[PDB]
Design a protein around this ligand. Structure first.
Ligand SMILES: O=C(O)/C=C(\C=C(/O)C(=O)O)C(=O)O
Length: 293
């Protein structure tokens, strides 16, 4: 199934960001897709993306001015982490990863994923992406992970309440993708942000990605609602926040973001050198390269 027939969801000639990330900056949420010929997609995949391999990822990384990446297993590859693992290997020390695993995965396989640069697993509660999300089995496997791993959790705001018991029971630290998709139109003190802050206030070891204005702010760039709603969250939880591009933007074909503009959101949500250093360097290093910290 030929590449130019599959779904393009990224800008092939992104603008240069006006903002220059600091030395050592980490794009802590990105993906590779395939290449399909070497790494086929999962039968459970709900989208069939165009190839977005390691060389494309590193070209994008370099174009935007990032030093390192956390390469997150994409749902189009299911529980086969091979493409992600190859991308991490090809990064020559400049990447770590997040895996998606069968909840029955054995400890030997988990150790091998660790050796291959994985530092956590992802639980995806979006039905449009993954049919099944067995909370019982997720809780089980979350307690069998290699030392120093965390879980990454992706959900929509309308199920945050229902997930509070599950997240409270998770025995390792938690990273929340895209803040659990709050409606940034509401403002920084709106309903979704208040609910999200209740979650953050329940456990000290819940971190979040301050990410994806393209996904959350339907007005489009400059995404003023995202900027105004998210900046206070970054400022109030400065030691618990990380950031990523979300390139190559799975499922964003209807509103393909310009990565230059995506990166230019950073100094809006993190206006000071202090917040930029924490969000882009210190915090993701603590989660993903703890041995260097
Ligand atoms: O990659 C993201 O950050 C978000 C999306 C896709 C996935 O989480 C995935 O396929 O693994 C989405 O919202 O469509």
């Amino acid at each position: 199934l030929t590449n130019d027939e599959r779904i393009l969801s990224w800008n092939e000639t992104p603008s240069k960001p006006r903002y220059t990330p600091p030395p050592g900056a980490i794009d802590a949420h990105c993906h590779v897709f395939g290449p399909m010929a070497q790494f086929p997609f999962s039968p459970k995949a709900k989208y069939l993306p165009r190839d977005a391999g390691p060389d494309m990822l590193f070209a994008l990384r370099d174009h935007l001015g990032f030093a390192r990446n956390v390469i997150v297993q994409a749902s189009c590859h299911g529980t086969d982490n091979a493409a992600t693992l190859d991308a991490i290997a090809r990064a020559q020390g400049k990447a770590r990863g997040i895996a998606v695993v069968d909840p029955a995965i054995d400890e030997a396989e988990l150790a091998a994923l660790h050796e291959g640069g994985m530092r956590g697993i992802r639980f995806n509660f979006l039905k449009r992406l993954v049919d099944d999300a067995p909370k019982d089995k997720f809780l089980e496997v979350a307690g069998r992970l290699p030392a120093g791993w965390h879980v990454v959790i992706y959900f929509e705001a309308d199920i945050l309440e229902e997930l509070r018991p599950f997240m409270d029971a998770i025995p390792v630290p938690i990273v929340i993708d895209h803040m659990g998709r709050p409606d940034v139109r509401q403002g920084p003190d709106g309903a979704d942000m208040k609910a999200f802050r209740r979650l953050l206030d329940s456990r000290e070891d819940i971190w979040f990605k301050a990410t994806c204005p393209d996904r959350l702010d339907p007005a489009g760039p400059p995404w003023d609602d995202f900027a105004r709603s998210v900046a206070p969250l970054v400022a109030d939880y400065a030691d618990r926040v990380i950031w990523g591009t979300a390139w190559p933007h799975p499922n964003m074909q209807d509103a393909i973001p310009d990565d230059g503009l995506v990166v230019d959101m950073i100094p809006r949500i993190a206006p000071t050198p202090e917040l930029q250093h924490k969000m882009l360097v210190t915090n993701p290093m603590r989660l993903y390269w703890s041995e260097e910290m």
